[model samples]
Target: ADNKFSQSANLLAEAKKLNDAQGGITEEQRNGFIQSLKDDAKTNPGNNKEQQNAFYEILHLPK
Candidate 1:
């Protein structure tokens, strides 16, 4: 099954990779990035804040 949560997580993973190659996050902050994401997922069942922050800059390449 394909859930939006997993979808969003993959998107974040890709973002992390891009960030590793030529994006803005420092390596140190990268672990914290994923940590917070996974940590928050338990409390919120939906892709709430992730969606908000996503459109802020991460996702939306072009439709």
Candidate 2:
């Protein structure tokens, strides 16, 4: 779990960096992309709520 969190934080940070670099994207566009990612992640076997919690928890992991 700890390793998963670490990797997830790195991935999320990288995604944020990519998003930030694309300054042309509007807030709505960026938000929409994030929502799309969430929707895609939900396709995993685990319950959606648990997956979402894990997702957020990953974003909070140590750098």
Q: Estimate the TM-score of every prediction.
A: 0.32, 0.35
Give the per-residue lDDT of model 2 (tens digit) for 1-63. Answer: 564343344556666676558854454554554454454454555655555664664333333
Name the best candidate (by lDDT). 1
Number of colliding residue pairs in model 1: 0
Deviation (Å) of 4 in candidate 2: 9.3
lDDT of 1 by residue, 1-63 (tens): 565553445656677677658656654654554454454556453555655565344433322
Q: State the lDDT at 61 in candidate 1.
A: 38
* Model 1 residue pairs with clashes: none
Candidate 1 regions off by >4 Å?
A: 23-63
Candidate 2 has a TM-score of 0.35
CA shift at 9, candidate 1, in angstroms?
Answer: 1.5
Candidate 1, TM-score vs. the true structure? 0.32
